[PDB]
Amino acid sequence: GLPVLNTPGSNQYLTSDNYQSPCAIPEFDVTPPIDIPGEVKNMMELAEIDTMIPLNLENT
Amino acid sequence: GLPVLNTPGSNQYLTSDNYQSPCAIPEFDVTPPIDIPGEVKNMMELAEIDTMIPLNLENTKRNTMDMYRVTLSDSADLSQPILCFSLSPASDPRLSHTMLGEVLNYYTHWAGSLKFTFLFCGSMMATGKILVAYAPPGAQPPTSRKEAMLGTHVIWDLGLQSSCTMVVPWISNVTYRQTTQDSFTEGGYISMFYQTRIVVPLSTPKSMSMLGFVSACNDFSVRLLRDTTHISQSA
Amino acid sequence: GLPVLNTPGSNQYLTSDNYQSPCAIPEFDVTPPIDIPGEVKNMMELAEIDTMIPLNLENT
Amino acid sequence: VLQLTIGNSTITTNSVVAYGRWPEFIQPTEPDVATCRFYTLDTVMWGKESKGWWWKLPDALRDMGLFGQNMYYHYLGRSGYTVHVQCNASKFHQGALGVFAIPEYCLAGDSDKQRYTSYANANPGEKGGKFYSQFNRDTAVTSPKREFCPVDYLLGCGVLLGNAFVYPHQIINLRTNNSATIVLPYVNAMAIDSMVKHNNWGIAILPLSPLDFAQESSVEIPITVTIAPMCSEFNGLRNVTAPKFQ
Amino acid sequence: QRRSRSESTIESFFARGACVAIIEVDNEEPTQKLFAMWRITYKDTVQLRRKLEFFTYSRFDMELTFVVTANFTNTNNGHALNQVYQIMYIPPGAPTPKSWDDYTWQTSSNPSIFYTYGAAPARISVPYVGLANAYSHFYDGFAKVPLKTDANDQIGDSLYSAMTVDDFGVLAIRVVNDHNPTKVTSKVRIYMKPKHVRVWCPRPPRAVPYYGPGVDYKDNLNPLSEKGLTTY
Amino acid sequence: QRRSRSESTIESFFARGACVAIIEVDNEEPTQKLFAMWRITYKDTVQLRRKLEFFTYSRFDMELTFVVTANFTNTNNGHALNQVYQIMYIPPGAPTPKSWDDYTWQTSSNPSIFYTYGAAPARISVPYVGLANAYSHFYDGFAKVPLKTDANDQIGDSLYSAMTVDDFGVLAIRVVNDHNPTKVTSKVRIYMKPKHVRVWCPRPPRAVPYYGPGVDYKDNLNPLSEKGLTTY
Ligand SMILES: CCCCCCCCCCCCC/C=C/[C@H](O)[C@H](N)CO
Ligand SMILES: CCCCCCCCCCCCC/C=C/[C@H](O)[C@H](N)CO
């Protein structure tokens, strides 16, 4: 068929990749999402929350 | 030619995939389809069909004809329930083997309103009121009619109508219950009591049987297809 | 390059397939066809031809 | 009261249409009168200990009227059916008859050899057959009966009788109705098929609730199965087929 | 209502590939396992069968996937190069091979796959090759009719619910490699994925274990378990 | 302000595939490691768990990648052909295999992968298969309630923070190849990459080592180290 050329990096698994994959459970009617409070869209939104500091760190 | 990159998951066979494949017999003039009656476009269409329930499952009545009919009579005690079973259409021994349960055993998740049509097989001169009650889970099973009438319930006059449709509305915390028996996604409790005992005149069979048919409503659906536990193959 | 996914059925040879293949003799000036009589476009055209039947099949 | 008349046969009474499809045609030979009669099968007594009865269609209508003659003379014929199961019961008779119309009603044999039942025993015809509480294995190795061993709760096909309502069904509940009518269209993988060898349908009259009457010891009421071939058209007229029934 | 029936569709209900047969093929010396002809049918395994017996008639474009798994037998230290397996179709009528080195393996008109061991499992799609307008999972008749004029009873004696003896031919699997002293026993598992499935006249599923290619049953006729009448 | 939050997104925070389980599968003789059923959960490993326990609820389309690494055990000079590993899903309820040569491996409706050793790791995407509208990393309740009318305390005795016993079924991995005298011990590492992640109700991460599948803890309850109050 179409002549392809396997470039270096084939048949590998890079944990940080966005490659597609076959859906193991096709035509799966997932549960519709509800408006749950406290949705986090970014991790820094958690850093912006002021959290108490373990300032004192003596042995006792 | 075109530089490609074999992503992880190549040269594998996932049984659940829609990949194309070479036609082994190309240019094959298949037989044209005809309009055969009873076309099924969805498995739930089979669950919507009301099928008799093996309600009675005693050691001597199961796996026979006695398991499909429940014996009720005027001599039967009114304080004790007629029949009782959890709303586990796929894991309850009574509902698991029903067509509904047979289709659910092939799926993991199920969600919908059920329908229990109880048919009276007594004489036309036999009258009475049967209280059919659905009690959602989270409380004591309705061991008494006073507890059963607190939840959803319907009074069925045996004289007026020979079959009563007890629709179990879809009430659940999770969007989909599991088909296995588990206490978090448990369905509920279906029970029957004598609102008014069966009253039969003379020359009438005092003890009569009844049938129960479980069915799925239009809102009923399933997901997470799986293998049924019913069938087996020794190897 | 382009991330591909080798589906099941790869590196096989199915005798009944219409996959492309590299031309072993490229830029090959084939002989032009002539109007030869008796062109058969379908095998059933041969079945439509009435052919004598070995009706009698005794041992002798 | 419903009074359904077809050809030269009238039946007075609800009727259900199998799979929501009415018997209709697809040069076939269609007797518009000679094959539309409601042929009445042999009446069967519904004993108190009865387990059920089963007939094969069109095998049941093989010796009744000109329908059987057209079925044997012609090679392949398609025919819808209208099965009226009438059970005369009084107000004091209790019971329920599941009338199931199984498409391709394959039954199980008694012998250990699978699919070993003979053609004569698999096609009883107007006589039909009966279900049995348990599965009695054939033990005559010298002369195997080669007959079905239909089990009530297994429907003779290993499935549960409770799920048998997936088929076109009708419940004769003696308290509300004394008769049932099922209109079966021609159901088959083929548009038309040989009827002498193939049985398009199978009617199963199974007592879902036992028959009782005034606390009597033994009670038996008649059940009459009247089958009407609707839109029966045959093709391939040729010498009559005379099957061996022994 | 609002929940979709996607996973419940017939196409989705049979979207899974089911092992329908396990074929043992060896490259032993001529001492019968050189090749193996398996009659193509889903009734060797009960799961996909039961899924199909849910309905009376079916029409689906099948998809067969062959997973070949080979091992060294009768040798602790065994060697053999990568084997190529020939999976040839022999539809009803095509000459079946009588040996490994048979002419029928030439596959002049029989479709065949040559799967190199270690590669992706050999997948091929097959259209609806049924003679009728739909596959007949259940047949309430015979192939012959014993007539009054038959000389003997075996002339018309046919198997019940059996349409054709050669239903859809045999799948002949062999090791294309020459017979090596090192015996490599291979198991070809055939997985059947019905596609474009259209089913007709639903039927309840078998509640008792299967027994043969028909609807017969011998033992284990107790599907339901013991349970109280009023026990939740 | 001007610096983008791309790497900090929830989709990016879980964009990495994390080893969630290591399954040991052998092809030994029938002397129990022939197959192995691992209850699918991220709580066998603490890293991806802690990343998920950052939030109370989650909804993500998972992506499982199986990396199979095989070795020869109990043999210095061992031989075996390329093995094929069957990774079958057994959702809650599907019959689990009791042996290697079990019928449930036919996968008539259970989704399964057949990974040929040496090929690219077996990757498959799974949608949000949660019963609720979001995955419950934390559950402040039980599955049962011990009632006053219960005959015994074990009727309603349930594990705290445990919703279902069979949470999402078991992943059954076996070697499809026949049992060879040469024992090939394989380790299937499952890597979980949550995709399309939507998280709700953030929670602080566990500062002490995990202990079981709940929020319990036994030892190593000293997260902070010694440091002066006025020491920079
Ligand atoms: C490598 C070439 C292999 C080609 C394989 C194509 C063979 C086609 C046969 C598929 C037919 C199986 C589906 C039909 C099932 C039947 O309905 C049942 N056996 C009962 O009738
Ligand atoms: C080869 C087929 C494999 C198919 C794999 C799909 C299995 C689907 C299960 C994934 C669910 C894991 C994510 C859910 C985590 C839960 O929230 C936690 N266990 C706690 O609730």
mmCIF file with all atom_site columns, N, CA, C and O in Angstrom, chain A residues 23-33, chain E residues 2-7 9 11-12 15-16:
data_model
loop_
_atom_site.group_PDB
_atom_site.id
_atom_site.type_symbol
_atom_site.label_atom_id
_atom_site.label_alt_id
_atom_site.label_comp_id
_atom_site.label_asym_id
_atom_site.label_entity_id
_atom_site.label_seq_id
_atom_site.pdbx_PDB_ins_code
_atom_site.Cartn_x
_atom_site.Cartn_y
_atom_site.Cartn_z
_atom_site.occupancy
_atom_site.B_iso_or_equiv
_atom_site.pdbx_formal_charge
_atom_site.auth_seq_id
_atom_site.auth_comp_id
_atom_site.auth_asym_id
_atom_site.auth_atom_id
_atom_site.pdbx_PDB_model_num
ATOM 1  N N  . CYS A 1 23 ? -9.992  2.449   21.638 1.00 0.00 ? 23 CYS A N  1
ATOM 2  C CA . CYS A 1 23 ? -10.898 2.425   22.775 1.00 0.00 ? 23 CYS A CA 1
ATOM 3  C C  . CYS A 1 23 ? -11.217 0.981   23.132 1.00 0.00 ? 23 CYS A C  1
ATOM 4  O O  . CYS A 1 23 ? -11.790 0.244   22.323 1.00 0.00 ? 23 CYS A O  1
ATOM 5  N N  . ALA A 1 24 ? -10.839 0.576   24.342 1.00 0.00 ? 24 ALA A N  1
ATOM 6  C CA . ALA A 1 24 ? -11.054 -0.801  24.763 1.00 0.00 ? 24 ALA A CA 1
ATOM 7  C C  . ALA A 1 24 ? -12.530 -1.129  24.902 1.00 0.00 ? 24 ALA A C  1
ATOM 8  O O  . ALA A 1 24 ? -12.922 -2.289  24.741 1.00 0.00 ? 24 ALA A O  1
ATOM 9  N N  . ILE A 1 25 ? -13.353 -0.137  25.214 1.00 0.00 ? 25 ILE A N  1
ATOM 10 C CA . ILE A 1 25 ? -14.777 -0.356  25.435 1.00 0.00 ? 25 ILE A CA 1
ATOM 11 C C  . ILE A 1 25 ? -15.531 0.598   24.520 1.00 0.00 ? 25 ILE A C  1
ATOM 12 O O  . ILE A 1 25 ? -15.978 1.664   24.965 1.00 0.00 ? 25 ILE A O  1
ATOM 13 N N  . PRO A 1 26 ? -15.686 0.266   23.245 1.00 0.00 ? 26 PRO A N  1
ATOM 14 C CA . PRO A 1 26 ? -16.285 1.209   22.302 1.00 0.00 ? 26 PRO A CA 1
ATOM 15 C C  . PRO A 1 26 ? -17.783 1.350   22.509 1.00 0.00 ? 26 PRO A C  1
ATOM 16 O O  . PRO A 1 26 ? -18.447 0.493   23.095 1.00 0.00 ? 26 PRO A O  1
ATOM 17 N N  . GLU A 1 27 ? -18.311 2.464   22.008 1.00 0.00 ? 27 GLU A N  1
ATOM 18 C CA . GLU A 1 27 ? -19.732 2.775   22.110 1.00 0.00 ? 27 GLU A CA 1
ATOM 19 C C  . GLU A 1 27 ? -20.194 2.695   23.562 1.00 0.00 ? 27 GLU A C  1
ATOM 20 O O  . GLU A 1 27 ? -21.216 2.090   23.887 1.00 0.00 ? 27 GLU A O  1
ATOM 21 N N  . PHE A 1 28 ? -19.419 3.327   24.435 1.00 0.00 ? 28 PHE A N  1
ATOM 22 C CA . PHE A 1 28 ? -19.630 3.279   25.876 1.00 0.00 ? 28 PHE A CA 1
ATOM 23 C C  . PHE A 1 28 ? -20.308 4.569   26.319 1.00 0.00 ? 28 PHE A C  1
ATOM 24 O O  . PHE A 1 28 ? -19.721 5.652   26.224 1.00 0.00 ? 28 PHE A O  1
ATOM 25 N N  . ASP A 1 29 ? -21.539 4.452   26.810 1.00 0.00 ? 29 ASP A N  1
ATOM 26 C CA . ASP A 1 29 ? -22.339 5.606   27.212 1.00 0.00 ? 29 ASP A CA 1
ATOM 27 C C  . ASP A 1 29 ? -21.883 6.056   28.592 1.00 0.00 ? 29 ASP A C  1
ATOM 28 O O  . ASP A 1 29 ? -22.414 5.629   29.615 1.00 0.00 ? 29 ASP A O  1
ATOM 29 N N  . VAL A 1 30 ? -20.889 6.944   28.617 1.00 0.00 ? 30 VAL A N  1
ATOM 30 C CA . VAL A 1 30 ? -20.345 7.397   29.890 1.00 0.00 ? 30 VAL A CA 1
ATOM 31 C C  . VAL A 1 30 ? -21.402 8.175   30.667 1.00 0.00 ? 30 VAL A C  1
ATOM 32 O O  . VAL A 1 30 ? -22.393 8.669   30.116 1.00 0.00 ? 30 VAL A O  1
ATOM 33 N N  . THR A 1 31 ? -21.170 8.292   31.963 1.00 0.00 ? 31 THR A N  1
ATOM 34 C CA . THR A 1 31 ? -22.074 9.040   32.818 1.00 0.00 ? 31 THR A CA 1
ATOM 35 C C  . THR A 1 31 ? -21.907 10.533  32.563 1.00 0.00 ? 31 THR A C  1
ATOM 36 O O  . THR A 1 31 ? -20.783 11.041  32.611 1.00 0.00 ? 31 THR A O  1
ATOM 37 N N  . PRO A 1 32 ? -22.984 11.268  32.303 1.00 0.00 ? 32 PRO A N  1
ATOM 38 C CA . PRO A 1 32 ? -22.846 12.692  32.015 1.00 0.00 ? 32 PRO A CA 1
ATOM 39 C C  . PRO A 1 32 ? -22.327 13.442  33.227 1.00 0.00 ? 32 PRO A C  1
ATOM 40 O O  . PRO A 1 32 ? -22.729 13.150  34.362 1.00 0.00 ? 32 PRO A O  1
ATOM 41 N N  . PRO A 1 33 ? -21.433 14.406  33.033 1.00 0.00 ? 33 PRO A N  1
ATOM 42 C CA . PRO A 1 33 ? -20.906 15.150  34.178 1.00 0.00 ? 33 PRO A CA 1
ATOM 43 C C  . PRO A 1 33 ? -21.926 16.125  34.740 1.00 0.00 ? 33 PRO A C  1
ATOM 44 O O  . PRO A 1 33 ? -22.750 16.688  34.016 1.00 0.00 ? 33 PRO A O  1
ATOM 45 N N  . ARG E 2 2  ? -32.554 9.803   28.407 1.00 0.00 ? 2  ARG E N  1
ATOM 46 C CA . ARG E 2 2  ? -31.370 10.603  28.127 1.00 0.00 ? 2  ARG E CA 1
ATOM 47 C C  . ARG E 2 2  ? -30.108 9.761   27.996 1.00 0.00 ? 2  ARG E C  1
ATOM 48 O O  . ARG E 2 2  ? -29.135 10.220  27.389 1.00 0.00 ? 2  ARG E O  1
ATOM 49 N N  . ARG E 2 3  ? -30.105 8.551   28.551 1.00 0.00 ? 3  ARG E N  1
ATOM 50 C CA . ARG E 2 3  ? -28.959 7.661   28.447 1.00 0.00 ? 3  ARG E CA 1
ATOM 51 C C  . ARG E 2 3  ? -29.003 6.919   27.118 1.00 0.00 ? 3  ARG E C  1
ATOM 52 O O  . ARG E 2 3  ? -30.033 6.345   26.750 1.00 0.00 ? 3  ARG E O  1
ATOM 53 N N  . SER E 2 4  ? -27.884 6.930   26.405 1.00 0.00 ? 4  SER E N  1
ATOM 54 C CA . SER E 2 4  ? -27.835 6.368   25.066 1.00 0.00 ? 4  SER E CA 1
ATOM 55 C C  . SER E 2 4  ? -27.693 4.852   25.120 1.00 0.00 ? 4  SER E C  1
ATOM 56 O O  . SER E 2 4  ? -27.191 4.284   26.092 1.00 0.00 ? 4  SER E O  1
ATOM 57 N N  . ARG E 2 5  ? -28.148 4.202   24.050 1.00 0.00 ? 5  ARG E N  1
ATOM 58 C CA . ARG E 2 5  ? -28.094 2.753   23.911 1.00 0.00 ? 5  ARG E CA 1
ATOM 59 C C  . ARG E 2 5  ? -26.912 2.301   23.063 1.00 0.00 ? 5  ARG E C  1
ATOM 60 O O  . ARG E 2 5  ? -26.999 1.282   22.370 1.00 0.00 ? 5  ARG E O  1
ATOM 61 N N  . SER E 2 6  ? -25.807 3.042   23.098 1.00 0.00 ? 6  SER E N  1
ATOM 62 C CA . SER E 2 6  ? -24.691 2.752   22.203 1.00 0.00 ? 6  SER E CA 1
ATOM 63 C C  . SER E 2 6  ? -24.083 1.388   22.505 1.00 0.00 ? 6  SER E C  1
ATOM 64 O O  . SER E 2 6  ? -23.914 0.559   21.604 1.00 0.00 ? 6  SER E O  1
ATOM 65 N N  . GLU E 2 7  ? -23.748 1.135   23.770 1.00 0.00 ? 7  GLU E N  1
ATOM 66 C CA . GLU E 2 7  ? -23.116 -0.128  24.128 1.00 0.00 ? 7  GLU E CA 1
ATOM 67 C C  . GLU E 2 7  ? -24.063 -1.308  23.976 1.00 0.00 ? 7  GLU E C  1
ATOM 68 O O  . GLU E 2 7  ? -23.602 -2.451  23.902 1.00 0.00 ? 7  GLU E O  1
ATOM 69 N N  . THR E 2 9  ? -26.164 -1.803  21.427 1.00 0.00 ? 9  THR E N  1
ATOM 70 C CA . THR E 2 9  ? -26.486 -2.103  20.045 1.00 0.00 ? 9  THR E CA 1
ATOM 71 C C  . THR E 2 9  ? -25.971 -3.489  19.675 1.00 0.00 ? 9  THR E C  1
ATOM 72 O O  . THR E 2 9  ? -25.047 -4.023  20.291 1.00 0.00 ? 9  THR E O  1
ATOM 73 N N  . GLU E 2 11 ? -24.399 -4.250  16.978 1.00 0.00 ? 11 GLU E N  1
ATOM 74 C CA . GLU E 2 11 ? -23.026 -4.081  16.519 1.00 0.00 ? 11 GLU E CA 1
ATOM 75 C C  . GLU E 2 11 ? -22.068 -4.006  17.699 1.00 0.00 ? 11 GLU E C  1
ATOM 76 O O  . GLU E 2 11 ? -20.947 -4.521  17.633 1.00 0.00 ? 11 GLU E O  1
ATOM 77 N N  . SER E 2 12 ? -22.496 -3.375  18.793 1.00 0.00 ? 12 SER E N  1
ATOM 78 C CA . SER E 2 12 ? -21.657 -3.284  19.980 1.00 0.00 ? 12 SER E CA 1
ATOM 79 C C  . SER E 2 12 ? -21.695 -4.559  20.804 1.00 0.00 ? 12 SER E C  1
ATOM 80 O O  . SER E 2 12 ? -20.707 -4.897  21.464 1.00 0.00 ? 12 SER E O  1
ATOM 81 N N  . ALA E 2 15 ? -19.254 -6.671  19.122 1.00 0.00 ? 15 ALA E N  1
ATOM 82 C CA . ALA E 2 15 ? -18.033 -5.979  18.735 1.00 0.00 ? 15 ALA E CA 1
ATOM 83 C C  . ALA E 2 15 ? -16.779 -6.642  19.279 1.00 0.00 ? 15 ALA E C  1
ATOM 84 O O  . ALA E 2 15 ? -15.675 -6.256  18.882 1.00 0.00 ? 15 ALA E O  1
ATOM 85 N N  . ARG E 2 16 ? -16.916 -7.604  20.181 1.00 0.00 ? 16 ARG E N  1
ATOM 86 C CA . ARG E 2 16 ? -15.772 -8.268  20.779 1.00 0.00 ? 16 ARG E CA 1
ATOM 87 C C  . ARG E 2 16 ? -15.409 -9.511  19.981 1.00 0.00 ? 16 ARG E C  1
ATOM 88 O O  . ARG E 2 16 ? -16.284 -10.256 19.534 1.00 0.00 ? 16 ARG E O  1
#
